[PDB]
Amino acid sequence: VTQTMKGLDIQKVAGTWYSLAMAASDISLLDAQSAPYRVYVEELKPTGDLEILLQKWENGECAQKKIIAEKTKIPAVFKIDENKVLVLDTDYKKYLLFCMENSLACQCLVRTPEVDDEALEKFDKALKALPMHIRLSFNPTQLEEQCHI
Amino acid sequence: VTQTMKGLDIQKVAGTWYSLAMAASDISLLDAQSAPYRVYVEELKPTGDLEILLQKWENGECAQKKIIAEKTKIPAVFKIDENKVLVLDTDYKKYLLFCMENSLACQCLVRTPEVDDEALEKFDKALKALPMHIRLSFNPTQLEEQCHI
Numbered sequence: 001v002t003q004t005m006k007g008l009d010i011q012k013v014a015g016t017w018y019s020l021a022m023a024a025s026d027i028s029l030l031d032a033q034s035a036p037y038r039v040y041v042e043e044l045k046p047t048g049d050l051e052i053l054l055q056k057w058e059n060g061e062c063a064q065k066k067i068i069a070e071k072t073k074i075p076a077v078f079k080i081d082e083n084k085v086l087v088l089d090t091d092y093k094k095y096l097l098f099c100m101e102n103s104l105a106c107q108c109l110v111r112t113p114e115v116d117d118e119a120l121e122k123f124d125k126a127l128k129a130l131p132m133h134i135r136l137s138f139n140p141t142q143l144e145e146q147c148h149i
Numbered sequence: 150v151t152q153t154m155k156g157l158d159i160q161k162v163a164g165t166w167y168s169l170a171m172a173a174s175d176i177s178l179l180d181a182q183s184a185p186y187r188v189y190v191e192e193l194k195p196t197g198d199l200e201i202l203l204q205k206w207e208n209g210e211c212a213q214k215k216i217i218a219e220k221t222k223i224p225a226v227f228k229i230d231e232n233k234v235l236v237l238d239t240d241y242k243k244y245l246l247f248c249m250e251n252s253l254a255c256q257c258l259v260r261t262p263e264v265d266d267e268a269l270e271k272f273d274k275a276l277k278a279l280p281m282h283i284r285l286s287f288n289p290t291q292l293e294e295q296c297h298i
């Protein structure tokens with residue numbers, strides 16, 4: 001991944017996000033509800049490390065989860081306990097494109113449970129470079145459900 | 150779906166095809182190997198009805214399958230025993246875009262086990278109109294395996 005947000009102010013990504021679309025390099029990273037990269041972002045809490053609240057389906061349950069992405073020399077790049085989180089683009093107010101890699105998955109996050117075509121076309125343009133083999137998107141009804149059910 | 154091949158000569162789609170990419174309106178139509186619209190086209194045999202040889206994963210097996218799409222008043226539209234098959238576009242030599250609907254799934258077929266970007270971008274342009282929520286694509290290795298394993 002060769003796209004990163006110049007001048008990312010991590011404080012300003014704080015609060016509520018919705019996983020509107022997801023893509024991955026391999027189908028099995030996203031194909032089932034229990035697929036490894038099938039994580040739904042709930043809330044981003046910058047400490048300047050980054051606390052992520054996400055939902056994730058495990059052994060027949062939607063589980064609420066709290067993880068820390070440690071900051072790096074680069075403001076737009078964080079690490080996870082192996083896995084690099086890259087923030088590609090964000091306008092802070094409406095959307096945020098990020099990828100994670102050790103296997104590569106990218107997401108289009110939005111502030112509100114709505115379908116944002118402006119954001120999805122930025123997401124699409126940003127995956128054109130990447131070797132993605134699965135893409136998903138969720139309707140507003142699924143954005144309000146635990147684990148996008 | 151509002152895109153159909155003008156002047157389709159069905160005889161000329163005869164022979165060998167590879168399911169290079171697939172999209173569907175609902176994730177559960179494509180997400181597992183046993184998902185309903187997760188069918189891999191092997192061979193198209195026009196009689197002028199259309200005989201399809203496809204592969205389909207059922208109860209832990211890749212099953213070879215033979216079905217008939219009955220012709221309609223419209224050359225580019227066929228029916229299946231409920232389900233409409235629409236041929237959107239084909240150059241006969243390299244690629245063929247088709248959709249099926251009762252739930253909507255579209256595929257980008259190619260003559261050879263290779264990744265055709267020209268064809269995938271035509272596929273992408275053709276799904277821009279459609280309310281797709283899952284897309285898959287397969288590498289050349291998977292195109293040569295039973296059920297794209």
Ligand SMILES: CCCCCCCCCCCCCCCC(=O)O
Pocket residue numbers: 039041044050052054056065067080083085087096098100
């Ligand atoms: C801008 C920051 C975006 C947020 C990035 C979220 C990435 C977190 C995903 C990491 C996967 C860890 C999930 C739990 C581990 C597991 O169940 O195996």
Ligand SMILES: CCCCCCCCCCCCCCCC(=O)O
Pocket residue numbers: 188190193199201203205214216229232234236245247249
């Ligand atoms: C240009 C023609 C393209 C070929 C169209 C192929 C569509 C066939 C898919 C129909 C699904 C039927 C599969 C078996 C039925 C089942 O297992 O439920």
